[PDB]
Scaffold this active site. Structure first.
Site, PDB file in Angstrom:
ATOM      1  N   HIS A   1      -6.062  -7.432  -0.329  1.00 56.84           N
ATOM      2  CA  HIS A   1      -6.238  -6.021  -0.653  1.00 56.84           C
ATOM      3  C   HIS A   1      -5.515  -5.634  -1.933  1.00 56.84           C
ATOM      4  O   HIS A   1      -4.457  -6.175  -2.265  1.00 56.84           O
ATOM      5  CB  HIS A   1      -5.727  -5.113   0.467  1.00 56.84           C
TER       6      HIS A   1
ATOM      7  N   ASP B   1      -2.390 -10.893  -1.954  1.00 55.70           N
ATOM      8  CA  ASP B   1      -2.977 -10.268  -0.772  1.00 55.70           C
ATOM      9  C   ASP B   1      -4.439  -9.913  -1.045  1.00 55.70           C
ATOM     10  O   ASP B   1      -4.804  -9.559  -2.164  1.00 55.70           O
ATOM     11  CB  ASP B   1      -2.157  -9.017  -0.419  1.00 55.70           C
TER      12      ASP B   1
ATOM     13  N   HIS C   1       0.813  -1.219   0.000  1.00 52.67           N
ATOM     14  CA  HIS C   1       0.000   0.000   0.000  1.00 52.67           C
ATOM     15  C   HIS C   1       0.844   1.267   0.000  1.00 52.67           C
ATOM     16  O   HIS C   1       0.291   2.361  -0.166  1.00 52.67           O
ATOM     17  CB  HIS C   1      -0.940   0.052   1.218  1.00 52.67           C
TER      18      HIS C   1
END
Ligand SMILES: CC(C)C[C@H](NC(=O)OCc1ccccc1)C(=O)N[C@@H](C)C(=O)NCc1ccc(C(=O)NO)cc1
Ligand SMILES: [K+]
Ligand SMILES: [K+]
Ligand SMILES: [Zn+2]
Length: 357
Positions: free
Chosen positions: A173, A171, A133
């Protein structure tokens, strides 16, 4: 025929001073490592030492300002650590966070170096804090620097600028940071599978949708596979690999594969809500091993059920070591919305990949 492994318990020192039960726990990596001992996998690997990334290495993907601000937290008082962390989306910072993020990145650089110099064929990196991220200019979602992105650029820096790197991000996300870092780049193919829920799932941005295919010369080199509706598991992830990930990846013909290997899509994860099994992760690992002459580096991202991530990541290492892969059910019908997602991605990327035409 040799698998590397990097783990350094120094990366446990990054911790949440305000809520010690925050799910991104120090024990994530020690539990994963201990499971490798229990399953007698550790002694089968070549142990790769961790190291700090240098600030010049961080500059491969991150702005000087962002590097300096995270570095400044090294000696901050608790009040300032709390204030700085609150300036980001979903970040906690302790005095050890910067060094732990440097160790996560440097561990993966050494692993990528071991692979590309032929010391090992493939490798696993049991590291934290996670990275995908993290943006060029900001920390986000428990991530300070984008370990996987940096490792791709590090790899190119010891081979050639145009070295073809595939980053598979499984992942649960979206790796917003990896997408943005490479969005205009045709040398790094980014493929992410992720829960999306039309923007209701973190990081809550339409950047994660299937119509974000890349920009400029990178059109086609950003593949978002977003899940909506159902509780996805092995059938949906296997189908996404069969219809999308593997055909595109084979056509790209990567020279190095990095897995942004979060294990929060795993059955039992407290926040993923998905049911990928350890056998499922082994199946996906073994698929990726058919690329890049086997040069695969598995990099821990998220994943928050300590038993689930320890078993799932250990099964991936078992695959890297050459153990027999699982036979799973490719005929189980998919959740209706998963077929819709796959078809949306196929339509978006057929302009760019002849294997989809
Ligand atoms: C049962 C709980 C573990 C649920 C979980 N809560 C949660 O993350 O706690 C964060 C927290 C902040 C402050 C003090 C204590 C704790 C959650 O999913 N919260 C939602 C709102 C969310 O999306 N939170 C942000 C988030 C960011 C990145 C990742 C990741 O793993 N990325 O790879 C996961 C979650
Ligand atoms: K992902
Ligand atoms: K790209
Ligand atoms: Zn995650």
């Amino acid at each position: 025929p040799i698998t590397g492994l990097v783990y350094d318990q120094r990366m446990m020192l990054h911790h949440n001073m305000w809520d010690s039960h925050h799910p991104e726990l120090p024990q994530r990596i020690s539990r994963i490592f201990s499971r490798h001992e229990e399953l007698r996998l550790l002694s089968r690997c070549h142990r790769i030492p961790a190291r700090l990334a240098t600030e010049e290495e961080l500059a491969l993907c991150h702005s000087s300002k962002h590097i300096s601000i995270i570095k400044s937290s090294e000696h901050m008082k608790p009040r300032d650590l709390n204030r700085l962390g609150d300036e980001y989306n979903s970040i906690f910072i302790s005095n050890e966070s910067y060094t732990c993020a440097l160790l996560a990145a440097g561990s993966c650089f050494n692993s990528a170096q071991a692979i590309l110099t032929g010391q090992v064929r493939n490798a696993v990196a049991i590291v934290r804090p996670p990275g995908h991220h993290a943006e060029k200019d900001t920390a986000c979602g428990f991530c300070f620097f984008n370990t996987a992105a940096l490792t791709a650029r590090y790899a190119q820096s010891i081979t050639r600028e145009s070295l073809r790197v595939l980053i598979v991000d499984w992942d649960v996300h979206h790796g917003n940071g990896t997408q943005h870092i490479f969005e205009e780049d045709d040398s790094v193919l980014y493929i992410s599978l992720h829960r999306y829920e039309d923007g209701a799932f973190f990081p809550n941005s339409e950047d994660a949708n299937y119509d974000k295919v890349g920009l400029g010369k990178g059109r086609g080199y950003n593949v978002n596979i977003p899940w909506n509706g159902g509780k996805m598991g092995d059938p949906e992830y296997m189908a996404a690999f069969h219809h999308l990930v593997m055909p595109i990846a084979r056509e790209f013909a990567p020279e190095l594969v990095l897995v942004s290997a979060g294990f929060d899509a795993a059955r039992g994860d407290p926040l993923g809500g998905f049911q990928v099994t350890p056998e499922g992760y082994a199946h996906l690992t073994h698929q990726l091993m058919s690329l890049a002459a086997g040069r695969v580096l598995i990099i821990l991202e998220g994943g928050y059920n300590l038993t689930s991530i320890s078993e799932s990541m250990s099964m991936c290492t078992s695959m890297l070591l050459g153990d027999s892969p699982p036979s799973l059910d490719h005929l189980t019908p998919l959740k209706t919305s998963a077929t819709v997602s796959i078809n949306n991605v196929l339509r978006a990327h057929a302009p760019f990949w002849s294997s989809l035409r």
